[PDB]
Amino acid sequence: SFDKTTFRLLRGESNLFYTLAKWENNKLHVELPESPTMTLIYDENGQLLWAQRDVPWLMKMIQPDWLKSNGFHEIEADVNDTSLLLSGDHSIQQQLQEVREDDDDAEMTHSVAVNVYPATSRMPKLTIVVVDTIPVELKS
């Protein structure tokens, strides 16, 4: 329902990462903004350069063709994968346990903002992907 609002908010986080990043000696240097979101940074060929967290099941859901354009996406995660993603969020596990007990095949929806930054004199082309780790179904 809030697709444009959700994208605009996550794009703000993407832009913050971009301003703070540096490129030196053919390597990306990422500074964290002053987290309920998880950011992934790819180069112009879709190579992952930097990830805020290491989450293999989620990386497989970021479709390579998305990385060419600015846009909003949602990914559907199995509830047990969302649960693991939110392992450190002890307050939300009881709601997830209730979702799982209600339906073994439950899926959680995670918002995704894909943001493209053409190469400049100081930075190569980057695609910054910001994922909300809190699923839409549980943001209440």
DSSP-derived pairing of the beta strands 107-117 and 22-24: unpaired
In angstroms, how far is the first alpha carbon of the chain from the final one? 14
Long-range contact list for 90-93, CB < 8 A, 24+ apart? 92/134, 92/138
Enter the tokens of residue 22: 């540096």
Q: What whole-number distance in Å separates Cα of residue 72 and Cα of residue 36? A: 17
Sequence-ordered list of residues with C-beta below 8 angstroms from that of 89, at least 6 positions apart, any chain: 133
> Does the annotation place 102 within a ligand binding site?
no
Sequence-ordered list of residues with C-beta below 8 angstroms from that of 42, at least 6 positions apart, any chain: 48, 49, 67, 126, 127, 128, 129
> Does the annotation place 104 within a ligand binding site?
yes
**Residue positions forming the annotated binding site for a divalent metal cation:** 104-105
**Residue positions forming the annotated binding site:** 104-105
